[PDB]
């Protein structure tokens, strides 16, 4: 057993490894979305920039969990990073809707992780999740909701003009 | 009687208390409007910013009247601040129309206050109203009229695109 | 149901609306206290400044809760802001005692809100309350306690000199 | 008749000359008060500074009225500047009370002047009085009221300590 380990349940250790994989998966989804908008037949450069930034943020989220695993004396166990659900994302609106779904799924995982940490009476882990993950998720979900609403109200996905102008005004 | 009181009719004192309440009410209306546009299903951040600024301005208007009451030796009497007429404001255009109606109502109250001050031969109070309130109201009403006109001409409220673009170009 | 809503109980939503009203009420109490000390027959300008600052802080507290409501996909429901308990606050000491009572009441409401959030297993809401409200309340209560103690020890409310000197040294 | 004179009643011209004398008288009262506090047996240097500043302000008030008289094509008529009512002012509190009485008397004169200007349909003169005199008077009266209140509450005039500390904290 690690010389640093204290009050860190094996179930929590395992759950943190699962969360690391999920964050990496989220980074991969956003990477794929980014380059969809870089296609010559889609060509929305600010959608591409927005999603690439999100992808880099998720990689940071994964790294912080790997750091946490080591800080607590757990051992990192990595799994394959699954390819994203979709190859073709259809429209800016559709990609934003996929992102919203993804972030709500990640949030659910984090809430399940918090429930476990609470059940195992691990207040350090609870605080870690609360401080570095929960409000970040709420902000991300709210922002994606805002984006979806604006695209819908503007006439997306039918209106190519709507997605073009959203690209310039909101994401530019 | 206050050692500072001079040429300040009890009717004017009472009217100033009523105006304080009205200014606070106006601040509350604009606060409510602001956060309507912050909803994930409305999501017009510059409408939200615009109305929040207006709300803060009305609170300043109320404070200046409270200061005036004390300067003249009257006594402040506060009443409940009523909740705004509407919870749901429908659209950017509708909120602007509500604001226009509100500011015209506040203007009418100020004109009635000025008539009273004139009738009681209180030139200090007349000058106070004229200097700090009347042109501010005329400018606010004109600006809201301008906003309503632009939103209508652009195709609001039916056009979600119109409200989106107005949010960026006029309020951004 | 809001596209952003996740793990946010209707009871929590309602409690947040109640808290918004309470914060606005607290802003109103402090506004009234501020202008009491601005009266020509009270004339303690630093008491007035202190309470006006507190009033503005409470308005910020209310706005942050309105922001939270929208972030979580709840819907803001506003109620009348009740006028403060007292019109005449008697002395600096009495106003400080009223403020202490108010802040302890607001704290109790926040603790009840936290209990609800805990019961509904909402760790994001728990963290929000803990981060933005609980220590702020403890600091405010401690500061008001300190102020009350000093005024008492100095000879308030009988000693007009005590309140005058406290105004200059502690609040100035 | 002056080549510049227009809509300027002879009664208004005369009233402006009377006001010039009153402003000069007020400057003289404050000059006398100032040097009372400079006496070795009174020795409150900030009371002395405060009243000397007030004296200089009144001289400016008189000059602006002399300027107005010429701007409108009236002719300045000067009278003796009467010595102040009191030679000995007793205490800081008593001097502040005398100043309050003086400023209320000057205010009454200005209100009478405004009534005359209104009766003679002279909106330029009304605006001049409103802009340069009326709120200045209200502020002065309020400030003197505040000062009187503080000195009383502190224990003046019996307490030499009260007047000493007021000199340092409020006027210093
Ligand atoms: Mg895994
Ligand atoms: Mg993100
Ligand atoms: Mg993440
Ligand atoms: Mg192991
Ligand atoms: Mg596969
Ligand atoms: Mg914590
Ligand atoms: Mg935080
Ligand atoms: Mg937004
Ligand atoms: Mg542009
Ligand atoms: Mg009222
Ligand atoms: Mg405004
Ligand atoms: Mg207003
Ligand atoms: Mg009364
Ligand atoms: Mg009602
Ligand atoms: Mg005027
Ligand atoms: Mg003006
Ligand atoms: Mg315009
Ligand atoms: Mg454009
Ligand atoms: Mg309520
Ligand atoms: Mg505070
Ligand atoms: Mg608060
Ligand atoms: Mg509902
Ligand atoms: Mg009631
Ligand atoms: Mg926390
Ligand atoms: Mg903290
Ligand atoms: Mg302390
Ligand atoms: Mg004369
Ligand atoms: Mg002066
Ligand atoms: Mg003068
Ligand atoms: Mg002549
Ligand atoms: Mg004589
Ligand atoms: Mg007029
Ligand atoms: Mg004018
Ligand atoms: Mg002015
Ligand atoms: Mg004052």
Swiss-Prot record, chains A, B, C, D:
It catalyses: 4 Fe(2+) + O2 + 4 H(+) = 4 Fe(3+) + 2 H2O. GO terms for biological process: immune response; intracellular iron ion homeostasis; iron ion transport; negative regulation of cell population proliferation; negative regulation of ferroptosis; negative regulation of fibroblast proliferation. Fe cation 2 binds at residues 58, 103, 137. It comes from the Eukaryota. Fe cation 1 binds at residues 23, 58, 61. The keyword Cytoplasm applies. GO terms for molecular function: ferric iron binding; ferrous iron binding; ferroxidase activity; identical protein binding; iron ion binding; iron ion sequestering activity. PROSITE patterns: FERRITIN_1, FERRITIN_2, FERRITIN_LIKE. It is found in: Cytoplasm; Lysosome; Cytoplasmic vesicle, Autophagosome. Belongs to the ferritin family. Oligomer of 24 subunits. There are two types of subunits: L (light) chain and H (heavy) chain. The major chain can be light or heavy, depending on the species and tissue type. In the human liver, the heavy chain is predominant. The functional molecule forms a roughly spherical shell with a diameter of 12 nm and contains a central cavity into which the insoluble mineral iron core is deposited. Interacts with NCOA4; NCOA4 promotes targeting of the iron-binding ferritin complex to autolysosomes following starvation or iron depletion. PANTHER family: FERRITIN, FERRITIN HEAVY CHAIN. This is Ferritin heavy chain. It comes from Homo sapiens. The gene is FTH1.
